Amino acid sequence: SFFHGVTVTNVDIGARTIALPASSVIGLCDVFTPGAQASAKPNVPVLL
Amino acid sequence: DPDLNSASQLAQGKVYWNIRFTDVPPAENPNFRVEVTDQWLTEVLD
């Protein structure tokens, strides 16, 4: 008697769906003047 | 659409509908083709 009772198990043997990662994400790097009105730091990436 | 509603496209929450139609084009060039014939010329006999 290794188990006495109901045993409900999810077997999880479906075929997974595959999606496309990202169509167009544009990596940009051009110069700018850091200061008061510019909210970014001169080396960190900023998501726009 | 049958081919785009696959079992894997529907599993991601993607369901496709096709709307095909035709517009009403503006009649910018209405052509009229006049011919003078003699088909009903024998109609003036009776």
TrEMBL record, chain B:
Signal peptide: none annotated. Belongs to the myoviridae tail sheath protein family. This is Probable bacteriophage protein.
